């Protein structure tokens, strides 16, 4: 399939900065969600789940079509808990009804990362809603009860290499697992609504114990109260992933640069940008605007 980006009619940078600002102001306002984590992490997870359905082999799924709005994908068991992110974005979409669903879900993730003090993520507009019959089937998102070989093979379908995989997984600095959503419980670290390289530091520095949670699933726990999924821990079991974990644990700037590239790529997979499409936009944070 070919999905050509088409700019929302007449819109330019200033329009999308206004959407960014509305998301960012609501992140500030709705700060109590999930015991004062706020909505930043769930919006990043939503951006990953809506883009992470992509299949490079046939260009199905991905961010372009905005198909999470349809029942089949909305009710994917892998998407449990993401309804909170969708409901957050509802009043944004009502204020800016011209933005496509795919542009909104992906911009939500960009805004959340930046407003949580993460790297700038260049972002391109022009995803176009596609009909219900284009919704990918359930089962395209990854399982957490797996090893490094599973992780590596899984991410090949998204055209991600080892460095891109390890960089993307650093988003697990954010938020937490919730037993009723995923069968896992606990946060990955302490500063879980600020985007940092703490995921890699915790992997390397904590004393992890393989325990069973209350859903009878194995997860790695530390005495500080942190947790890692089996797939997270696989990044220090595999020697190639381990080298990259060590790199990002020792170089915050390199992690930010590599995450920004990999996250933009994730959100753009499947999309053909015409020769005369606008350049990627770099949005100012509220702090940078004095707002
Ligand atoms: C092997 C790959 C991955 C697996 C197996 C995985 C699995 C999970 C699981 C089980 C949860 C807990 C959901 C819940 O209980 O609420 C979670 C949360 C989360 N995921 Fe991942 N994930 C992966 C990769 C990614 C990537 C690539 C990103 C973004 C770049 C991401 C972003 C997040 C965020 C931010 C949260 C926290 C959400 C919240 O606090 O509500 N994940 N993931």
Author numbering: 4 to 294
Text taken from the publication that reported this structure:
CcP employs a heme cofactor to reduce hydrogen peroxide in mitochondria using electrons from its biological redox partner ferrous cytochrome c (cytc). The reaction mechanism is comprised of three steps: (1) reaction of the resting ferric enzyme with hydrogen peroxide to generate compound I (CpdI), containing an oxidized ferryl (Fe(IV)=O) heme coupled to a neighboring Trp191 radical cation;16 (2) single electron reduction of CpdI by ferrous cytc to generate compound II (CpdII); and (3) single electron reduction of CpdII by a second equivalent of ferrous cytc. CpdII reduction is coupled with proton transfer to the ferryl oxygen, with the distal pocket His52 as the likely proton donor. Here, we use an expanded genetic code to examine the impact of hydrogen bonding interactions on ferryl heme structure and reactivity, by replacing the N–H group of the active site Trp51 of cytochrome c peroxidase by an S atom.
To resolve these uncertainties, we replaced Trp51 of Saccharomyces cerevisiae CcP with 3-benzothienyl-l-alanine (S-Trp), a close structural analogue of tryptophan that cannot serve as a hydrogen bond donor, using an engineered pyrrolysyl-tRNA synthetase/pyrrolysyl-tRNA pair (PylRS_S-Trp/tRNAPyl), which selectively incorporates S-Trp in response to the amber UAG stop codon. Stoichiometric replacement of the distal Trp51 residue with S-Trp was confirmed by MS analysis of the intact protein. The geometry and environment of the heme cofactor and key active site residues are well preserved in the modified enzyme, with only minor conformational adjustments to the distal pocket His52, thus confirming Trp51S-Trp to be a highly conservative substitution. Time-dependent spectral changes were fitted to a sequential a → b model to derive rates for CpdI formation and are similar for both CcP and CcP S-Trp (k = 96 ± 3 and 100 ± 2 s–1, respectively). The CcP S-Trp CpdI EPR line shape is very similar to that of CcP CpdI, confirming the formation of a coupled ferryl heme-Trp191 radical pair. Oxidation of CcP S-Trp also diminishes the 757 cm–1 feature of the ferric state but instead leads to a new feature at 791 cm–1, which we assign as the Fe–O stretch. Density Functional Theory (DFT) models (vide infra) of the CcP ferryl state predict that the Trp51S-Trp substitution leads to a ∼0.02 Å shortening of the ferryl bond, with an associated 44 cm–1 increase in calculated Fe–O stretching frequency, which correlates well with the 38 cm–1 increase observed experimentally. In contrast, time-resolved UV/vis spectra reveal that the ferryl heme of CcP S-Trp decays to the ferric state with rate of k3 = ∼ 0.04 s–1. The Trp51S-Trp substitution in CcP and CcP W191F causes dramatic 64-fold and 32-fold increases in the kcat of guaiacol oxidation, respectively, with only modest changes in KM. In contrast, the rate of cytc oxidation is only modestly affected by the Trp51S-Trp substitution (kcat = 819 ± 46 s–1 and 596 ± 33 s–1 for CcP and CcP S-Trp, respectively).
